[PDB]
Design a protein around this ligand. Sequence first.
Ligand SMILES: [Br-]
Ligand SMILES: [Br-]
Length: 293
Amino acid sequence: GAKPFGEKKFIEIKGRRMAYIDEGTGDPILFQHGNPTSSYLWRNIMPHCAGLGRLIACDLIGMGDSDKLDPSGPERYAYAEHRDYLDALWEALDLGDRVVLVVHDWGSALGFDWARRHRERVQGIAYMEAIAMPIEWADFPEQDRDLFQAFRSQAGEELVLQDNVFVEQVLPGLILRPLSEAEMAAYREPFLAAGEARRPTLSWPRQIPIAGTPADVVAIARDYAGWLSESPIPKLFINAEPGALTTGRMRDFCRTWPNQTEITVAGAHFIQEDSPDEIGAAIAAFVRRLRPA
Ligand SMILES: [Br-]
Ligand SMILES: [Br-]
């Protein structure tokens, strides 16, 4: 299904207008995409949670139907800058203190961080192919290692801003089934233009806490990893086979997390495109359990 879930709403944040999905009533079930994705990534999963709460899917700034930052540059869209826009967006949405988090990739780095800082408001965390902890190159998926190493080099501007590699090569390359034309249109739409409109999908891999750099993001991930490993908050780990990011040591460490349910679905990185109904069913099961009658 290539059809988006529901419709986009917009809200002005820090003078910056962000796009989001908000469907239903009750405690929110917050789904957050990462790079180079948008709310669209959850379109076939969110339906499974219908009637279970308030279904919300935000577009990170510079992503999806969210406004671009201007002026943009190599120093724009760092982690700190996304969190400052996201924090204010999640505040404006009045989510309450019984939020379930559903996270992926930078959505998990961001969601996990948010969760630590607001642990009291977090009913539960469902995560998959996440940034669970700072890592080394040896832990990074082999097939894409030297490419991710090049994004974090001066070649990074040519690969991404000029050629849109993350959107056109990384994203298809880590989904196990052939995407449809309408589906690749929706992922490429926010990045149709060459240059700075594609800056966020280059700044994101530059932000990954790898090999001790960058130190601020490393620190934040050190922080929430230590916390998550100790929090009794209910967790749903959607493991993937063969998976990509959350394998090996990081997978090892995640399996250490308390009060955690784990399932395995078919997929590489963007597993919502390979196993949306298995992921959806599991998330709705998790929320039901968290929200009886
Ligand atoms: Br593929
Ligand atoms: Br990335």
